Amino acid sequence: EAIVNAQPKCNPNLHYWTTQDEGAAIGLAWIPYFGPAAEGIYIEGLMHNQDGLICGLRQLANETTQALQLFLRATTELRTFSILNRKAIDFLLQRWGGTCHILGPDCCIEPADWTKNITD
Amino acid sequence: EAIVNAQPKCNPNLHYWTTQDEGAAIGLAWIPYFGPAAEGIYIEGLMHNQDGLICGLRQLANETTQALQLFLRATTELRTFSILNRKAIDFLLQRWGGTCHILGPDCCIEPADWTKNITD
Amino acid sequence: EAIVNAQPKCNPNLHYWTTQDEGAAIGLAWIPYFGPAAEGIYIEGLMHNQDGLICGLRQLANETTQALQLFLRATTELRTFSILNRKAIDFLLQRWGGTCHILGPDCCIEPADWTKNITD
Amino acid sequence: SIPLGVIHNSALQVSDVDKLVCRDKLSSTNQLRSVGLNLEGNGVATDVPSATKRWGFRSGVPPKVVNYEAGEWAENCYNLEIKKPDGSECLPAAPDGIRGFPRCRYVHKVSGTGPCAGDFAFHKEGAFFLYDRLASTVIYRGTTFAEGVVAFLILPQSGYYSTTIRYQATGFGTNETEYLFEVDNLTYVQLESRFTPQFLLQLNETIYTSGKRSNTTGKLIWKVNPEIWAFWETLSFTVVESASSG
Amino acid sequence: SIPLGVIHNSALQVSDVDKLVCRDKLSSTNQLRSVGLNLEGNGVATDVPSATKRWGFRSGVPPKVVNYEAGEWAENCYNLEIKKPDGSECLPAAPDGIRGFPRCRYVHKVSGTGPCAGDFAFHKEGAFFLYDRLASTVIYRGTTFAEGVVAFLILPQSGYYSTTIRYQATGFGTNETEYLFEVDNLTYVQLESRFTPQFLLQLNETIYTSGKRSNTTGKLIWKVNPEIWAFWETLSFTVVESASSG
Amino acid sequence: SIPLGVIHNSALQVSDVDKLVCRDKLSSTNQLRSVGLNLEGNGVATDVPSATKRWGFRSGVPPKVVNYEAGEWAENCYNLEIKKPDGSECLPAAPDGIRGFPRCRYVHKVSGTGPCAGDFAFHKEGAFFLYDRLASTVIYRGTTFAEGVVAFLILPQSGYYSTTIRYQATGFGTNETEYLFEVDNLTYVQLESRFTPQFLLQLNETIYTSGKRSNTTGKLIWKVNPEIWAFWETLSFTVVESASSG
Ligand SMILES: *[C@@H]1O[C@H](CO)[C@@H](O[C@@H]2O[C@H](CO)[C@@H](O[C@@H]3O[C@H](CO[C@H]4O[C@H](CO)[C@@H](O)[C@H](O)[C@@H]4O)[C@@H](O)[C@H](O)[C@@H]3O)[C@H](O)[C@H]2NC(C)=O)[C@H](O)[C@H]1NC(C)=O
Ligand SMILES: *[C@@H]1O[C@H](CO)[C@@H](O[C@@H]2O[C@H](CO)[C@@H](O[C@@H]3O[C@H](CO[C@H]4O[C@H](CO)[C@@H](O)[C@H](O)[C@@H]4O)[C@@H](O)[C@H](O)[C@@H]3O)[C@H](O)[C@H]2NC(C)=O)[C@H](O)[C@H]1NC(C)=O
Ligand SMILES: *[C@@H]1O[C@H](CO)[C@@H](O[C@@H]2O[C@H](CO)[C@@H](O[C@@H]3O[C@H](CO[C@H]4O[C@H](CO)[C@@H](O)[C@H](O)[C@@H]4O)[C@@H](O)[C@H](O)[C@@H]3O)[C@H](O)[C@H]2NC(C)=O)[C@H](O)[C@H]1NC(C)=O
Ligand SMILES: CC/C(=C(\c1ccccc1)c1ccc(OCCN(C)C)cc1)c1cccc(NS(=O)(=O)N[C@@H]2CCOC2)c1
Ligand SMILES: CC/C(=C(\c1ccccc1)c1ccc(OCCN(C)C)cc1)c1cccc(NS(=O)(=O)N[C@@H]2CCOC2)c1
Ligand SMILES: CC/C(=C(\c1ccccc1)c1ccc(OCCN(C)C)cc1)c1cccc(NS(=O)(=O)N[C@@H]2CCOC2)c1
Ligand SMILES: *[C@@H]1O[C@H](CO)[C@@H](O)[C@H](O)[C@H]1NC(C)=O
Ligand SMILES: *[C@@H]1O[C@H](CO)[C@@H](O)[C@H](O)[C@H]1NC(C)=O
Ligand SMILES: *[C@@H]1O[C@H](CO)[C@@H](O)[C@H](O)[C@H]1NC(C)=O
Ligand SMILES: *[C@@H]1O[C@H](CO)[C@@H](O)[C@H](O)[C@H]1NC(C)=O
Ligand SMILES: *[C@@H]1O[C@H](CO)[C@@H](O)[C@H](O)[C@H]1NC(C)=O
Ligand SMILES: *[C@@H]1O[C@H](CO)[C@@H](O)[C@H](O)[C@H]1NC(C)=O
Ligand SMILES: *[C@@H]1O[C@H](CO)[C@@H](O)[C@H](O)[C@H]1NC(C)=O
Ligand SMILES: *[C@@H]1O[C@H](CO)[C@@H](O)[C@H](O)[C@H]1NC(C)=O
Ligand SMILES: *[C@@H]1O[C@H](CO)[C@@H](O)[C@H](O)[C@H]1NC(C)=O
Ligand SMILES: *[C@@H]1O[C@H](CO)[C@@H](O)[C@H](O)[C@H]1NC(C)=O
Ligand SMILES: *[C@@H]1O[C@H](CO)[C@@H](O)[C@H](O)[C@H]1NC(C)=O
Ligand SMILES: *[C@@H]1O[C@H](CO)[C@@H](O)[C@H](O)[C@H]1NC(C)=O
Questions:
Q1: Does A30 lie in the same domain as A40?
Q2: Cβ(B45) to ligand 4 under 6 A?
Q3: Are strands D220-222 and D187-190 parallel, antiparallel or unpaired?
Q4: Domain range for residue B103?
Q5: Are C12 and C43 in a shared domain?
Q6: Phi-psi region for residue F133, left (φ > 0), alpha (ψ -120 to 50) or beta?
Q7: Does B21 lie in the same domain as B73?
Q8: How many structural domains does chain B have?
Q9: Of F48, F200, F208, which is best to mutate to test ligand 17, by the most ligand atoms within 8 angstroms of its C-beta?
Q10: Among all ligands shown, which has an atom nearest to the Cα of E203?
Q11: Does the beta carbon of F62 lie under 8 angstroms from any beta carbon of chain E?
């Protein structure tokens, strides 16, 4: 489905904060005893509304809430960290969970580069 | 291996309870502030012993206990939620963890639909 | 990259402890009420420096620390158990996350056994 | 490894992911299910004296918890509140997020005392205590549980009524344990293994409906004389403060 | 199922992994992202009287927490310390590992009292309370949060200044709630929904810079007479201890 | 990203999953292993005065825990019980489920006091404190740990004796720290970095076997005069209550 922003307003600019997991260190800064406190581990970025991405993003989060809340109701984990991992597994199962029939719409195998090798 | 029920009795009927993760909401029921309490989130179903499934299921759970307990002894997680996810990963690794040799018993690729395209 | 041990010393022998997950039981030992206490669940082994494995292993753990600490800084999980599972998923995505082009360097499909079947 | 249930040739079989042929299709994690099954379904005795002998105290073993997604409506559940003779609690309070079993026809709530020679109470047959979608190796204080076991499967691609039955125990978890079914705070019946939940409910009704409750401030204890299977397949009162009920 | 955001034809679309064509490439988990978005960006009223009406107390519902990797710099956050009239705390202490929202221009710290007819405080519109990379369904005592919602995406293959604004409340979380902006422990201003954070800061500066603070030990309460949109797109003092400020 | 150990051409190499050729086969998660390696194996000084200088207190940094499946039998472990001079504890109690390191030849238990200018004690070189299959960035009170580091690998497809050695410390975790090896509650030896665990054990035996223990109720402190490598590759008593032992 396409995302239709149905909000009274949309801030078209996204000033965001996140953490750098790779966080290339400068000397001993990676050592927790010498490194930043909890308040200084964040990087920042600015992202404009190219492709309408920001306004779509706000609408997408609004529409995710119902399914997310129902998922959280049904789970017994106090803190859920595995939603994205379970979606990566579901991605692979959709494509590789059964027998792959070459030239089938549900099999993501392209024989084109090698189908010329035989006919040459 | 086949499952042989070695129990003194087998209730052939399974009156079960579970939760609906998709839980298609009716209005505002998905909002936790307005939604059901912890006691009213369950759906129910009834399942008869077709294919001997119920009696096999009781025997299967009985036989799972030893391996499950040994797994729980060896783990340091207080609450284990990832057994099924780790089995989905193991499913994919068994089939796609190496090079897939077409027409090998261990490679789940069927070239039949396209092997006619070449010979036609 | 290759592992170059840059430590003042290297104990070339590895006397290790671990747990047996499969832990083939002897009678009722798998039942937690009858089984070993927390102190007696360990097996042991001895491993010598074949292929320089032990000295490389000590150097590898030393070099893993910086990335591991930066990962732990950026995470909000108090106890992290999923690093190896997430690397198994990343292993499969690298190979099967897109369309597999047969005879491409990035597609791990060997058609050799069947490419003779056509030409015969 | 942990066994896995898959249907082949119209029969349930145990076969782990490494023993699966290419014909077997796993298209999403939704096909994977963890379920809890009640020991009642195997024909075990579910009366309080029989059930409690299957549980014992032990030290040195850390408790463990595993989750399951779906369970079975139980007929018999248990809720223990046990203290040592000096008054210290024997069972740990339920950890955060662990609630009682959601479907019980009869909850056998037992309050009593015992030596409690162990940090945690385990299942002597290795089964689990089933809570709300969480299965534990140990009993938690005041939390309703069902005895049960967990299975893992690959799937191929009447209201709810609960009644609480209260008991008192002395010398809990020992070779010499005594139980009393409770009618109120001062009226009790000596309990026997033969007494079904329905019999206890009808006994409670009979005692109330014609006036056998203790009309003093003392402890009145009755007794059912000996002259008086599976749940899914189915008087004169004198006082001798002990008593009798033919 | 939980929706998933993927860019197709230069537009953001919702399409779960089962609805992806072979052209879509997922080469690592790094392409998967969970993000938090602030309700401010949708144009909701962020003044304390408006925000608090969106929160209410409820019992019987266990709290739940889900994590997200990246968030939005907020203009308005909230930090609640509410007790019942008898003095018992209304909100749970923050669990271990749950810190406040990391980027707030104004933190509206509210201390007050209310009936608190519920175990936990939830969002009446179903939104989340955003903490440091953790989103909760409930409010924690004394912990800075932003109202917000979470999205999940597949990616295609000026310093920080924070100012605390303190308020007092009576009858919190009811149909009759009163607020006072705090200048010090004894000087207060009656608060109205129209009062922006910048107006409150300039009001606080004006009162200090020429001497309208309480010069006694009594509670001095001012009032701004009625004669006096989105954050990203933009006097005489008399005393009548109530007062007025034209 | 987090490095990964894979054997290629008969040598251990670091290569993450994105740098693996099709020849590399990963058939199950069992091939993936997380291991803990002891700093002793690198030749670090394991005497109490040297080890403690590698640890320091710090605030503002949340502790973190990562698990590992297999560890190395250690010769030296440490168990700290440190209080501030006013008696408040310096180290947090061990969280639920965190037990001591399972294989230690010598456990150096240290009880003492220090300023403790920080909420948690970290490793100054960035190493980890290894507990039972759990590695932490911080020290827990009274819990036996080994200093160590964690590796992650792809695999290609004599009883246990432990001896406790007790020490007293003043001014712990400072530039001026003093230690005393403890023989009993009233007999002590001034400790030096040169003193190996075996030397301390033989010193303890010698003092007992011929009667150098304090025969009063006062604190008797001895001293070993200066006239008196890796673990895997290898007298007259006078009193001057200080003393000497040539
Ligand atoms: C899976 O189902 C099995 C069969 O129901 C369960 O086996 C049970 O195992 C427990 C111990 O774990 C036994 O209890 C002990 O048994 C022996 C005496 O043997 C019994 O023999 C017959 C069997 O019915 C019975 O009539 C006797 O009275 C004995 O009890 C002694 O060590 C103790 O007295 C104690 O009772 C059960 O008897 C046994 N059941 C059966 C029917 O054999 C097994 O535990 C299940 N697996 C689980 C729950 O993980
Ligand atoms: C996604 O965005 C939606 C649109 O902004 C959010 O819808 C909001 O839903 C809440 C309840 O969950 C509403 O609050 C209640 O609304 C009704 C009255 O309707 C309102 O109608 C107009 C709309 O602007 C407004 O002017 C009126 O004053 C009413 O408030 C009553 O039940 C209550 O009084 C209460 O206010 C919001 O009004 C509604 N917003 C809009 C703009 O319609 C939705 O919650 C978002 N999803 C999330 C956060 O998960
Ligand atoms: C991986 O192994 C490396 C080599 O063993 C470890 O390097 C150690 O890093 C710590 C700090 O993290 C150093 O301690 C500090 O070092 C300097 C002074 O340098 C030292 O130089 C020589 C080296 O032997 C030594 O003789 C000197 O006395 C100095 O100590 C100062 O900042 C401090 O005084 C403090 O001692 C270690 O010296 C250093 N070891 C070596 C052998 O260079 C590295 O930490 C390991 N990575 C981990 C554990 O994650
Ligand atoms: C065997 C019963 C069962 C159980 C079960 C429950 C309790 C104890 C033992 C077994 C089951 C039900 C729901 C589950 O999870 C749903 C929530 N999840 C999103 C987290 C898991 C197990 C179940 C399984 C699959 C589907 C359906 N229904 S059906 O009408 O299609 N009949 C189909 C036709 C072929 O075999 C069943 C019911
Ligand atoms: C939409 C903004 C965003 C967010 C975001 C943040 C907050 C709220 C909503 C959306 C985002 C940023 C970082 C994230 O996680 C990093 C740490 N992770 C290792 C745990 C997650 C989401 C983001 C996403 C991807 C890449 C970059 N930067 S870019 O310069 O390449 N521009 C690219 C060119 C095409 O679209 C962006 C920024
Ligand atoms: C390097 C030692 C080691 C370790 C290790 C242990 C401690 C510290 C550093 C490395 C190891 C042992 C067991 C592990 O986990 C088992 C429990 N798991 C089910 C949770 C993990 C790492 C280990 C690894 C694999 C197999 C075996 N034995 S072997 O006889 O086959 N020799 C094979 C022949 C080729 O290289 C070894 C031992
Ligand atoms: C309990 O008492 C019985 C009495 O027959 C005795 O045989 C049994 O050994 C006792 N059990 C224990 C554990 O002492
Ligand atoms: C019966 O005793 C219980 C347990 O002490 C108590 O909570 C309850 O109020 C009592 N009921 C009556 C009717 O006295
Ligand atoms: C016993 O019967 C009385 C009278 O009907 C009723 O109030 C009470 O709940 C019953 N008790 C039980 C345990 O069923
Ligand atoms: C009083 O209690 C006795 C038992 O002690 C019972 O038999 C009798 O019926 C009761 N009497 C009345 C009037 O309830
Ligand atoms: C709050 O007071 C108003 C006054 O107009 C009334 O209409 C409303 O019903 C009250 N709310 C509740 C929940 O009693
Ligand atoms: C104002 O009141 C707060 C809350 O009681 C208190 O912590 C603070 O010290 C007070 N400030 C002054 C200047 O009195
Ligand atoms: C009010 O102004 C005074 C004087 O400049 C300043 O110290 C104080 O922090 C201000 N208060 C707020 C809430 O901004
Ligand atoms: C004293 O306080 C009053 C308000 O009660 C204010 O109007 C007046 O300016 C203050 N006077 C001085 C000298 O600060
Ligand atoms: C500790 O004392 C020494 C004495 O030489 C001094 O040089 C050093 O600076 C002191 N350390 C600190 C942290 O004050
Ligand atoms: C030695 O002191 C410790 C610590 O106070 C104490 O527990 C122990 O009992 C003492 N031992 C003797 C023999 O006095
Ligand atoms: C010291 O020696 C005595 C006598 O053999 C023994 O009891 C004690 O355990 C020893 N202490 C240590 C720390 O080895
Ligand atoms: C008594 O203690 C002293 C040290 O104060 C020691 O030298 C002496 O041998 C001890 N005497 C006996 C008889 O144990």
A1: yes
A2: yes
A3: parallel
A4: 81-120
A5: yes
A6: left
A7: yes
A8: 2
A9: F208
A10: 13
A11: yes
